[model samples]
Target chain A: GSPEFMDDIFTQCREGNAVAVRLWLDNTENDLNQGDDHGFSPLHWACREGRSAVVEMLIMRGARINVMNRGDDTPLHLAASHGHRDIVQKLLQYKADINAVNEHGNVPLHYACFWGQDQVAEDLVANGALVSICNKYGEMPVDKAKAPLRELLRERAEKMGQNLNRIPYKD
Target chain B: NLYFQGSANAVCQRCQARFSPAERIVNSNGELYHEHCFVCAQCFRPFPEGLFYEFEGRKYCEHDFQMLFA
Candidate 1:
């Protein structure tokens, strides 16, 4: 859905188009792992697109498997933060870095909490993520979740794994 | 050379609060303040007690007694 074509799909992605995104990816003898100024590859674009199909295609075609964007946010981080379940699912299947922290020291869970995206939080929890981990300010993912969602996250975290009974800072 | 003269108590340079110098006490150096005041000494917090003053010619802990004087 872009009027201009740059360096094929990789380049098209830098501009935020979905179709040319997958096409340039398909057409180019280019590296799907190739990055722009921000270390973002086609995979990053697909995830940021928040559209399931293109991201799925990008993964099926083999894009930046674990590329860390300028913010050190992997595709899973972006997908999760955006509440793109399908995208998140695809990325997780690829074994993305669920714990990658951006410049602010916030991992994907931190972003999900900041955005209050319960689905994103749930998706991450399902993907073998640790809930008690903290952001730069020591705020847990549960700390970032909103009202009812807070308890939901708590339950999700408990159901998946971890010892929640002990108080934090108790060695 | 009597460092201490009379019944004057030892004062904390940081808290400016007086404690009985006549009694024996051990200090952690970190806890230059009284036992109850260690939290503020390390955290550099302001307490109701004044920072520093002199007693028996010895400066002691009270409140923010740290001075930048050369």
Candidate 2:
């Protein structure tokens, strides 16, 4: 009920205002990893909006790269889905779980393919993302890919010599 | 009944303070609180028979409970 309790740093991150983010993180006790009602942290918003600078700053400020929202999406997943290649690279550099699955059991690679982000998907695979993983629907990352992307993941999967059905997925 | 073993480790969820084993503690709603801290959020009074009403995670006296909800 107290409107004063609400801080808009999440918005600042979404808008890619690195200065505002830095100012708030310096001045206030507002949690860097705090999530809004939908469980979207500042890191999630920055990645979704493709704010590479903001993402780097937030990571420097101790933002958890793997914090999940209500949809169970980490910042890596958001960046991958939105085709933010730079943000995806930054997240991976910070030790994000590349093969981490969401509520739908789909990893960031799945989103990269599902959204037809060839380079992002390739970056993930290059970072040791397993194409063997499947979603809740039992679909592999290549299964969700379009024409060119599908072939890319398929070749990568074959070259890795990993069985898509080898490992069982845990929730 | 209050127990006093003269040790303090349990935290009072209501006030975010720690209670010693020598102090009286009220355990309700899966949280530990000082007898004084475990009071109705509306009336700020302790409950009788260690009984109180909970709505949306806040405790309330019977009178205030009825006044607010009933």
Best by lDDT: 2
> What tens-digit string does per-residue lDDT give for candidate 2 at A32-121?
888877788989999988998989988997889899887677999889978899999999988999988776577898778765688999
- How do the residues B1-70 of candidate 2 rate in per-residue lDDT, one tens digit apiece? 5876776567878655566768988777587876756876433356866667887567777765664434
Instruction: Flag regions of model 2 displaced more than 4 Å.
Output: A1-7, A165-171, B1-70
Q: Whole-model lDDT, candidate 1? A: 0.61
Give me the TM-scores of chain B across the candidates: 0.29, 0.71
Among incorrect, acceptable, medium and high, the docking class of model 2 is: incorrect
lDDT of 1 by residue, A48-98 (tens): 656566677677776666787655667777777667877777777788887
TM-score of 1: 0.59
What are the candidates' individual DockQ scores? Answer: 0.01, 0.01
